[PDB]
Amino acid sequence: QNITQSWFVQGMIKATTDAWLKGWDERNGGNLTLRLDDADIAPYHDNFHQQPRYIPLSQPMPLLANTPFIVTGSGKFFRNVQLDPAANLGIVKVDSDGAGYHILWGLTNEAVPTSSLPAHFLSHCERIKATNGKDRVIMHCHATNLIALTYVLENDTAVFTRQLWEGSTECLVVFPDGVGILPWMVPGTDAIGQATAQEMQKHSLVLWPFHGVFGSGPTLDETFGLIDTAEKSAQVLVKVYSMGGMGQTISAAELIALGKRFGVTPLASALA
Template sequence: MEFKNSKYVEKMCEITNELYKHGWDERNGGNVSLRLTQDEVDQFDDLNKVIRNIPIKFDATPLAGQYYLVTGTGRYFKNVHNYPERDTGLVKITDEGNSVDLLWGFNDGGQPTSEFPAHLMTHIARQKVDSNQRVVMHCHPTNWVALSFTRNLDEKEISKLLWKMQAESLVVFPEGVGIIPYMTPGTNEIGQATADKMNEFRVVMWPHHGIFGCGDSMDEVYGLIETVEKAALIYTTIQSQGGDIKQEITDDDLRDLAKSFGVTPNPKFLSMDKVK
């Protein structure tokens, strides 16, 4: 089988198309990277030679030898499912760590997303937390971004707000969400700030811009971001209806929910000491 027809490329096409249809990746906004193992790469005969070497503006030595299927810079997610070999590429981090070898894709001369250093920094951080982590996803969910304009950029406040918008939130992201200050995108500085937060969270807010999420699979990370955005949408809807809340999910309700589903809320945001 050629790599173009692999389940990895098919899933990348599916997820990027869904992100676009949700309106979370307008124009060329957003990027995704998926780590592949050596055994997964070895299944394909067309990945046995280097097409070209691409410099990267980051020392990725801790990831040397790892493979990443990544979306390209300047590429529109609405096109990926039709042109995966143009708009995505499979790269291997070189031993020197300052470049990648292209093994497949970017067939028009393209390169990995400008946020690739930020992705790699997050991959480094998350692999230290959980070696199974292999996906990083960045997009611009509308209601999530709106929260960064109307609410305090406080991790406890935003996390508890989202937990209380729907029962699923606490179950899906019990650690809550991380928040960095507004920073210029596409820089190593924003990448490092994000990676630092990824030591504790799987979701990080880029205020006035978007979201960074990570996890074990494309479906998991997509579902994580989808759940966060759904909670933010419910909040937006409440505000559009006047914001007068008559009843709510209480802290005690959250504790009962955590106990029932066997999850542990971030203790900095919610203490479990009062569980009945």
């Protein structure tokens, strides 16, 4: 089969298309990268008909040496990935010393990876370390209700985590480490990539106020489902707040009992 029918190209199409249908990825909003093994891509080598283009990295990462990824392109729309995966996605392989990468497949007509790729790489590095190599996905999208909440809730990790845990029972179990929140920062900068990667050490979800969310996970579905869980809770919260707020909710005691039953250690600071 053609690489377009591969599990990982189909996976990238599914995730980007689902996020598009959720209303989280207007225009080129959002970006998605997936760490692969050589063994995933090697069978499809005869599908690679052009010369690998080289792009240097300003900050090398030796931890990622020789590692292939499939990634969304700069200025590309999640809506279009299903229509032309080769135009909108690329497979890249970081070189031997992590000083740059080669584009191996896709990103046709001189397209390049998302301008956020260096920031994705830094977060991949921190998640590899934090999860002993199990995490493989970084997903950014403009999740609508989470965005709306950033204007009305204290932009504070403990406050925000507690509300999201209250907003759907599964949340504490899905993200016991809570949701990290940064100050508003200029997107595309080194600073925002650094700050995100730091919080990725402590959380699988990071919020960018007035902008969107960053998630990490071992697979596309687990990462998408993580974001979707947080966004569903946020959707419930927006309804409840719009109705004048909570008359009742999940208590700290109930949340602790929940953690205990499911063998997770919830972020203590959100349990007042």
